[PDB]
């Protein structure tokens, strides 16, 4: 029961093992984000596919994460939004069930994010001016 | 709101520099502010000391104060010093560091205004 390795490369193989298992296989989820009655159809699921895209790259990119598939920053974890330990959330917990824990604090983390990469880039330019 | 806090030494002795500190909670040194350095004398009134902009960084110091008043600022630490030299007998006083500004969100434009518990410095030998 312990001591076995497991490795995947499906899709959403990794969907059922554990965050830091699951955290191994990244590129190839990230590949397949992007790829008269029935031709609307195909036109539109085109154009809906772009979009969500470029809006998820873009809020990447504003966060100073652009082209980084694990980027971590500067912002401090506060405990509010969780009490657990890396132990019991990293080998014993998985990404959807983490989703739906967090699901409520995401927009916070998000503007704190941006906020501190403006101040960062502020910051970075004053540096440079000297 | 913006949350200001003075720290630093209680005493200073006659013709050192006293050096002051002033934390801010709640917002940015670096934005678009305005933080000013003022001094009240024991029973007398008040009397504004100097100022810095947390963004440019000018300084703006009183015209009695110049030549031996210095302000400065830090966005890493989040706080903004003052420098006094050749504290006399006369500077005695409570010190506060505060802020005014306009906040216009959205539809609507409010003035905040922020002030220090303030502390005391007295200056003997």
């Known amino acids: 029961a312990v001591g076995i390795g497991a490795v995947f490369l499906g899709f959403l193989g990794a969907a059922g093992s554990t965050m830091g298992a699951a955290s191994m296989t990244l590129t190839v989820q990230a590949r397949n984000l992007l790829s008269t009655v029935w031709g609307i159809k195909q036109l539109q699921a085109r154009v809906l596919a772009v979009e969500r895209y470029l809006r998820d790259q873009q809020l990447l990119g504003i966060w100073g994460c652009s082209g980084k598939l694990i980027c971590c920053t500067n912002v401090p974890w506060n405990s509010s939004w969780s009490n657990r330990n890396l132990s019991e959330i990293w080998d014993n917990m998985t990404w959807l069930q983490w989703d739906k824990e967090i699901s409520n604090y995401t927009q916070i983390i998000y503007g704190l994010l941006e906020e501190s990469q403006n101040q960062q880039e502020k910051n970075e330019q004053d540096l440079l001016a000297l | 709101q913006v949350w200001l806090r003075e720290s630093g030494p209680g005493l200073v002795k006659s013709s050192e520099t006293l050096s002051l500190t002033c934390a801010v909670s709640?917002?940015?040194?670096?934005?678009?502010?305005?933080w000013n350095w003022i001094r009240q004398f024991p029973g007398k009134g008040l009397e504004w000391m100097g100022n810095?902009?947390?963004?440019?960084?000018?300084?703006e110091y009183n015209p009695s104060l110049k030549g031996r008043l210095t302000i400065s600022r830090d966005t890493s630490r989040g706080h903004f010093l003052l420098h006094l030299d050749s504290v006399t007998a006369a500077d005695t006083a409570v010190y506060y560091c505060?802020?005014?500004?306009?906040?216009?969100?959205?539809?609507?434009?409010?003035?905040?205004?922020?002030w220090g518990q303030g502390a005391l410095v007295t200056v003997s030998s």
């Open positions: 505060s802020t005014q500004y306009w906040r216009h969100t959205g539809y609507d434009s409010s003035f905040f205004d922020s």
């Open positions: 709640g917002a940015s040194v670096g934005g678009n502010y305005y």
């Open positions: 810095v902009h947390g963004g440019s960084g000018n300084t």
